Design an enzyme around this catalytic site. Structure first.
Site, mmCIF file in Angstrom:
data_model
loop_
_atom_site.group_PDB
_atom_site.id
_atom_site.type_symbol
_atom_site.label_atom_id
_atom_site.label_comp_id
_atom_site.label_asym_id
_atom_site.label_seq_id
_atom_site.Cartn_x
_atom_site.Cartn_y
_atom_site.Cartn_z
ATOM 1 N N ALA A 60 -35.248 1.334 -10.381
ATOM 2 C CA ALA A 60 -33.879 0.815 -10.382
ATOM 3 C C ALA A 60 -32.972 1.589 -11.298
ATOM 4 C CB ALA A 60 -33.864 -0.647 -10.788
ATOM 5 N N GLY A 101 -39.448 0.649 -8.645
ATOM 6 C CA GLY A 101 -38.996 0.939 -7.269
ATOM 7 C C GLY A 101 -39.375 2.345 -6.848
#
Length: 692
Positions: A60, A101
């Site tokens: 992120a 992520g």
């Protein structure tokens, strides 16, 4: 962004968003555009996704955390759906960093190729969340239930070479990842049939309930007021189910954790640490002075601990004392401290030796003559400060910063003892100074902006959380803690006893309650302070309970006897009858008939006394923002990390409610204490929080 380039029938998509190729909107959009271009180009046989510079991707993008952009399509979920739907094989070319992520993105590819030395992690648990784009479902499919559980619950990184023998990586290479991944992609690009997807693999385990039953207990034990760890484990447990059922359960656990006050608290503390460096009128880029060598005045407990912070960072220190014997004492304490950590396996004896190698010692002010930063750590008495700072003003080179460790005293007056008050600043460390993270930087009226910016930079170099306070009695931390202690005292008058109060606040989550803390600091210190105050302009009331305690000579751990009794080698604070008798009698002597005080009332009176004073601090401009006060409480006073700080906690309770509780306490014993801070009552009436 993501760059796109074809070479030899391989479309290479490169995540490019320094410093860590955060998966922000533009980067996610680049990945999708690249995929669309690669799928249309008949010459493209396969696709490589990699990262520019020092990461595959750290996950992120923090700069977007809190924009509309964080949730704007294409999301990472929609990115992965596109990768999974590709008819052309997608090879992730992982180096350096693949976390959160970023790792989730690599797992959504057909194949993965890694170079060694790459940090692999799913650290979501650290902000109170879980990996919410398939990581909990895909990772156990490639490394096994237990190994994924461990990575996801701990949040800890693992070097890429250690995955040899699992399915995480299809190939691990020693050097450059890109050429080996392009070559890999050429080979799968020629094959025909459909390419594998991690979602098709099955998690295999001979006894999952057996494992999980054990893991649940150990996780619950370690997690101590944080809900995320168990939820992470329960998400990873879902990987035994069909993929889409597991993924829905992951998503649910994510959305649950997003609601928790604990995830809010962990985020507040993450962002608050970063914001503590912001000073409204000292912009980023204000130039700083070079600090290469340091000196500390005083070799006692404080001076010693301060010194160690510098030694640990590679910055030499000279300690000045009066008597040679003080030096010998002090230096031996420092080496003892370091050898203690080496005994506990927290550094090597060689690292000890190099740190002690950076320590010098003098008896002459004249060997402080080319130190760039001098930190005074002597007796808390203005006349002693005057003697020190006058010496420093003769001796110190021009441009040296002269800092006082004072926790109480007027830095503007310390500064006025010199011809260069612009170079005088408070650097208030907390005991033990080599452990406590908090550095309260006190900005004198005359303190230069360059000097302030410099101390902030030095703070970060020696791994402190530096928070700036204006000059007032007690700055931020101690000014607030006086109000907290005052309430503690009053509780004893009204019907509490010391162990009861300490347990209640420790259950709320403080590391150490006020009576144990009084005993550790030495109750005599506060006694002398109070005695001088009663003579001064102040006619504040305190419970005399603490005075009566010191009149018995019960100073605390240093005399074996404070609010509690202490036995050597024994960590337990033991309640004492004589103490408890004095308290009960004291209520008699005020004509107070004692009542049963709930743990809830104890916590509110203590915490809300912090909050009210913090709001006066904010109104005065002594602290520049509410999160700064939270970081002070998190890093200096053992305020529970899972609740974020006093101001955030007030917000979480609802300032409307806080003001009501205050108005109720104003009707009671010493109601003068519970006038609502103007800023707090204004926020309450407008429906706002201290932190937004």
């Amino acid at each position: 962004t993501a760059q796109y380039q074809v070479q030899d029938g391989v479309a290479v998509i490169t995540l490019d968003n320094p410093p860590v190729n955060g998966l922000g909107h533009s980067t996610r959009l680049g990945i999708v555009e690249g995929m669309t271009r690669a799928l249309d180009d008949a010459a493209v046989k396969a696709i490589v996704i990699t990262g520019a510079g020092k990461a595959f991707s750290g996950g992120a993008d923090i700069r977007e955390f809190n924009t509309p952009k964080a949730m704007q399509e294409p999301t990472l979920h929609s990115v992965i759906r596109v990768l999974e739907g590709s008819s052309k094989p997608v090879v992730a070319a992982v180096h350096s960093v693949a976390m959160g992520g970023g790792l989730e993105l690599a797992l959504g590819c057909n194949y993965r190729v890694a170079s060694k030395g790459a940090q692999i992690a799913l650290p979501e648990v650290k902000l109170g969340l879980l990996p919410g784009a398939g990581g909990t479902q895909r990772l156990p499919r490639v490394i096994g239930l237990e190994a994924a559980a461990n990575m996801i619950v701990s949040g800890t990184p693992v070097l890429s070479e250690k995955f040899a023998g699992t399915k995480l990586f299809d190939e691990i290479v020693d050097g450059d990842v890109l050429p080996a991944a392009v070559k890999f992609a050429q080979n799968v690009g020629a094959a025909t049939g459909p390419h594998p997807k991690v979602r098709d693999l099955k998690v295999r385990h001979e006894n999952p309930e057996g494992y999980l039953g054990f893991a649940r207990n150990t996780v619950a034990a370690m997690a101590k007021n944080f809900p995320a760890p168990l939820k992470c484990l329960e998400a990873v447990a879902g990987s035994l189910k069909p993929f889409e059922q597991g993924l829905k359960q992951e998503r649910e656990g994510f959305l649950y954790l997003v609601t928790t006050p604990e995830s809010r608290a962990l985020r507040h503390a993450f962002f608050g640490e970063r914001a503590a460096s912001k000073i409204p009128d000292v912009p980023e880029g204000t130039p700083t002075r070079k600090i290469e060598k340091v000196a500390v005045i005083g070799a006692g407990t404080m001076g010693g601990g301060i010194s160690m912070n510098f030694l640990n960072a590679g910055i030499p220190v000279t300690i000045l004392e009066t008597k040679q014997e003080a030096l010998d004492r002090g230096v031996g304490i420092i080496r003892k401290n370091y050898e203690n950590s080496a005994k506990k396996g927290k550094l090597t004896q060689e690292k000890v030796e190099q740190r002690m190698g950076l320590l010098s010692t003098t008896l002459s002010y004249d060997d402080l003559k080319d130190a760039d930063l001098i930190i005074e750590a002597v007796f808390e008495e203005m006349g002693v400060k005057e003697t020190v700072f006058k010496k420093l003003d003769e001796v110190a080179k021009q441009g040296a910063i002269l800092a006082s460790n004072t926790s109480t005293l007027d830095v503007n007056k310390i500064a006025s003892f010199t011809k260069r008050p612009q170079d005088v600043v408070g650097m208030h460390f907390f005991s033990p100074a080599n452990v406590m993270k908090l550095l309260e930087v006190v900005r004198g009226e005359k303190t230069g902006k360059d000097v302030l910016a410099t101390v902030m930079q030095v703070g970060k170099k020696i791994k402190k959380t530096a928070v700036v306070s204006g000059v007032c009695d007690g700055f931020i931390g101690n000014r607030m803690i006086e109000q907290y202690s005052r309430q503690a005292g009053y509780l004893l008058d009204e019907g509490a006893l010391p162990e009861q109060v300490d347990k209640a606040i420790e259950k709320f989550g403080f590391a150490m309650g006020p009576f144990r803390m009084g005993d550790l600091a030495g109750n005599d210190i506060g006694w002398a302070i109070r005695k001088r105050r009663a003579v001064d302009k102040p006619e504040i009331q305190y419970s005399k309970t603490a005075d009566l305690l010191c009149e018995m000579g019960r100073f605390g751990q240093k005399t074996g006897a404070g609010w509690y009794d202490y036995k050597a080698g024994d960590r337990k604070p033991y309640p004492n009858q004589q103490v408890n008798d004095m308290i009960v009698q004291h209520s008699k002597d005020l004509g107070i008939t004692r009542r049963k005080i709930s743990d809830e009332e104890i916590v509110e009176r203590l915490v809300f006394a912090l909050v009210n004073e913090g709001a006066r601090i904010l109104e005065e401009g002594i602290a520049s923002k509410a999160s700064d006060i939270d970081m002070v409480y998190l890093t200096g006073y053992g305020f529970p990390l899972f609740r974020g700080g006093p101001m955030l906690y007030a917000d979480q309770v609802g300032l409307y409610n806080v003001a009501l509780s205050m108005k109720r306490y104003a009707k009671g014993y010493h109601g003068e204490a519970w006038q609502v801070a103007p800023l707090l009552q204004k926020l309450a009436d407008e429906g706002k929080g201290f932190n937004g």
